[model samples]
Target chain A: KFSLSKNTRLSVMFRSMFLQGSWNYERMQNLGFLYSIIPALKQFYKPGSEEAKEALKRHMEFFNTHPYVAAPIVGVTLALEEEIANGVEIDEAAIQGVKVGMMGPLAGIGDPVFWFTVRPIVGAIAASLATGGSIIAPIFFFVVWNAIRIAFLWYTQEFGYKQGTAITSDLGGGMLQQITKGASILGMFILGVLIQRWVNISFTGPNAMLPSKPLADGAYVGEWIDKAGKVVVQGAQTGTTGDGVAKFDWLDQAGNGVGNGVAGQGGFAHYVTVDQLNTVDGSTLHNILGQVSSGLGLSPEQTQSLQDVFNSLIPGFIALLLTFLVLWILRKWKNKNAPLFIIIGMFVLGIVLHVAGLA
Target chain B: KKFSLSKNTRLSVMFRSMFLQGSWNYERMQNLGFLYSIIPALKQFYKPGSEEAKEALKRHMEFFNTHPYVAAPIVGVTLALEEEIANGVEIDEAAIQGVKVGMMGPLAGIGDPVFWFTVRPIVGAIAASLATGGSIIAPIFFFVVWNAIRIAFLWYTQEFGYKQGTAITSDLGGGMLQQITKGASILGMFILGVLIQRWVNISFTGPNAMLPSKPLADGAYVGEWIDKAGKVVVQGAQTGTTGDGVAKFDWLDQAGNGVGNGVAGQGGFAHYVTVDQLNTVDGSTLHNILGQVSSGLGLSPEQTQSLQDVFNSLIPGFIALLLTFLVLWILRKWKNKNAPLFIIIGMFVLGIVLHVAGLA
Candidate 1:
């Protein structure tokens, strides 16, 4: 946390990139770690009765900023232990290294629980509602998800205040894993429910309506006819770029163009539009990607090819972008600079444009 | 797709962010990997464990972060293993052959059909429909009584987490899949049934539809004849040297601009009387001459001249605007820009001026 330590960039774990883009976790863990760390720290620096207030202030300050997952757990554990034994003068390595070592396993649990299950289910509902044309989704998500978070936030905060940093972190770590199992189960269940309610399948067929043309006799006419029809439809459909849903090894003239076109654009596949195949003939998307990537200077084909190479370098680029971006945000924040100029520019432009438009 | 040493990429995923999602799973996984890597991004769907589990979980937890297609199926399996190891049950390689790993693929397949195809598409479609207008919302999409499924999930999963993993696993793996499949398949079939509905090519037919009608057939649209009432107003409005250029036409409303709706918006009684007026209002060339002279709106004579240039520039601007405004649907109303309105108003005034000047 904000204690003596090698600074590590911490945000919500797992899909932190995705969350930071839009859905940052209103964190409860560090607050828990903070309130939990108080009693232990008192042993090292015996501030006595003032220790609770000192830990609370530090906890509040640290929670406002992001904290590394490591050491905080260890710090909290020591804080909890200080009630009985000489926990304050804990092994610094055991405190830092042990928790740091535990991060991998702990993250494995938290990743599935908080990041995977709870966040998405809530986010999905919020997103579905919002995208489904409800203004209330964002409001609901902001409230409901936060309420759920606040409960844990309270518990963790209580621990940070009650226990020492190491014990608090370690103890609160229990909740983190507990939350994940519940979350993962909940997530899978939702998927089950979602499948039951929503999953719509399509193929060109009355056979799909009937029990999949019942795996008939070896000389089955229904099977033969259905298979023949599917082949023909698949052949024609796959050849054309109409759906982008059909599988590969499809007709060459059909699948070939979209593959080239998608590959050519965004330096990779962008499957939002089904008509990227038409772009193979027209060179539209690739043309646009070229224009955008090069700041609208390059010729369309030149732009397409450049981005194609860039798209080809994805996961590496993503990891690199992440590795740098997280640290970069922290360093800039540390140096006391505001981040993300685009948002500022966008807000200004949006307001101006909206006013101008109404005018 | 073909395997090689080139296949092993550390930079593979980060490098191929656009071109590929995490590949190198079962090559057998045809469309799921292809689509999930980009379209839905399967990995984005999953969550990891918390401190307790993370403390217990292995380092390969990093594996799932990068390679979702590879990692997701394994998670259900891992849960079972942890449960067995935690209880007094013995751990073994056999658990891989045990019911846990066996369920992974089928569950994944089920998840794919249910989550990616069903939930996403239905929701996406619902979103798209809501975006267009409120009227077309189907009975089910709008009225179906529902629970906040995720909350239900979070509640039950937490309760079940303390219990045995197999019971939960079997509950998920067995009965839910069957119970849900029937309904999901119906929705799927319903969607599949309506797949071709988006493709529409229709048109309108009526009188006063075409002007300058007949080059070959004589007297198809003789302006001289069929001139019934309102002669004085007609004469006053006529620009003999130039044509009237103004044609009587119905206006269109709710005509989709682009993106969301097709070229012609919904053809229903509800559509507003939106006019498909083109760029004649800003008849920049003619407007420039007179507009150049007007010293109104607190403008200096010099400023008026500058205004004239912006006005004149619209002649070219009109061309660019119109090309961009090309409609994909036949009889789809053309989108209005300032160009056409200005062109027409400029023409009207110019026509009147020329007639008054005895030039026409």
Candidate 2:
């Protein structure tokens, strides 16, 4: 009750996003976390010695259960560690407010950024690399994850110290609020693109309608993709003898961004591909680019599949929108923790509308 | 009195790990340029004669700046439009504030999701695509032009709206603060996701550092990317006809997300090969995967180059860090917008550091 009432319980939940992955970077980051708590741990424990240590340990254990909120308590601990190191007494009240105010915003960010964008983006690349046999997917993972944390760690410490108590009321709120505002604006732009490109959120049969437009050649999305696929392939191999250069004029027919690189050695195509290496010729890249320029002629089928991969862009955006709407709606259902029904109802209602629209 | 204040421009110009191209869908997106201004001229000249009607023309010109901050005021106008449509003579202050405040956060949020994460990521993908094809790459200009309006628009609109909305502060700023807070509150969550994944300045570097030590191996960041390109070509091919008209395995290798396969492969690898349909025969999907997996073993120079793709991934975090520093330094110099010397000095010092750091 003391920890919960004291506000330690909820803060830990916020920390979960910070610590969820990156088992290696965690070592360095955890040092900051440990450093943050050391003072509070020592102060709370010191005179009582053994009893204090045990009590503190138990307190942290309880705290860990709420990892998401607790994440930024790291900032609190860090702030305290600096103040205590400077021989300043802890301002318990001020500390509580910072933790309280920051947790909601940070958690709000963590759910969408960490779960939807960060993981998915890195995962996409990693998944691609791993499938290619590079065992290098982790490379992208580590790079992206730690870069973000270092920024947070630096800013949090600098801001917490300089701004002090006022940090909670104005700048903290202002910066965080502005950050979210900026982020939202940014998110909307992303969502727009995602809706068009990434999310597999398409429907069949007159699914996309405009007043003047009909399906191209009276074909649906699936069929148009198929025909485009055929045009690209047949266009690439014109007048080509194996082990010789193929002169393709069909590239002009490919249209706009599709007509540039129409010349390449035909046999070199199979030398390397598919998350692995098929060839390492000195001019392989040139040949490949030539293939793409020529109506994506060299890789028409691959290009089409990319249209779908592009859709993941929408997936994250949608996930963000869903998370945003649900959390706020949940909060509205009662400012306290919401029942699971809020989300379930929203989902069920959305699904029904979707089905009805499809029908 | 003349004062020099650097602009408060905090865009996440971190573009290293994001895809630059894939989000190029421009169906409903029409270019908004000169002709759009003509829409309001007739009304301004012939004034509908009411005071409220006169104000409508003023708002259209304000929108000409066409940037984000410039946009904040539109909600104020839009509320008025709604009021007009709803047939209310006395535009409620509560409604105006409600609309502006509600729209601010949400508009910011939606903008972040759509522009920063989705649009920018796709632009990144496209730029990368163009680069991969050895095409002329001009995305920096595209970005600069797109964003410059936002910077300009925001500054002017905030000022313009201050002049316009002050008459109804209780209606605009006060109510808007809450409503915007609400909308922002909802949209902020989405923004948070973007900020974290696409915007947050956090990175984990040692996740795969042999699980403990940081070897100086530039394997992934340096070599594996090139190697992966080769593999991706195969994966792209697999995307076209993997199984049951679902191969295109070779294209998947290029798509780089363990994606675009079987259901319909990724695309872009077939033309690089023999194109004889000899190896691409009916059951080529299995062969496509095998060829890619084997290529990882590196029998050819292209295989070796693919290793560069793998290697580059190792440094994306570092690249992002380096980029942040570069942009901050540039921002500092960018303050002297007209002075070429400041820009030159900044670039020179940065170029030197990059050169020494092996980044140049």
TM-scores of all models?
A: 0.22, 0.30
Tens-digit lDDT track of model 2 for B175-265? 4545545565555455444443444332223222222223322222211221213332332332244344443343334334554233221
Task: Give the per-residue lDDT digits (tens) of candidate 2, residues A1-359.
Answer: 11212243223323334553422332323333443354445544465677555534432321221233343455545445445445457554444445545655556655655555455556665665666555456776687667765555555544544555554464445666565566566555655554444434343223322233332321211111111222222244456557555544333223522432233333211112212323222243344335434433222132222223334454355445656786687667774546667767867866875666531
Alpha-carbon lDDT of model 2: 0.41
DockQ category of candidate 1: incorrect
TM-score of chain A of 2: 0.38
Candidate 2 chain B lDDT trough over 10 residues, lowest sum: B9-18
lDDT value, residue B127 of candidate 1: 54
Q: Which candidate is the best by lDDT?
A: 2
Candidate 1 residue A165 C-alpha distance from true site, Å: 8.9
- The B-chain TM-score of model 2 reads 0.28
Q: After TM-score superposition, what is the CA distance of residue A204 in candidate 1 from its true location, in Å?
A: 9.5
Residue B152 in candidate 2, Cα distance off native in Å: 29
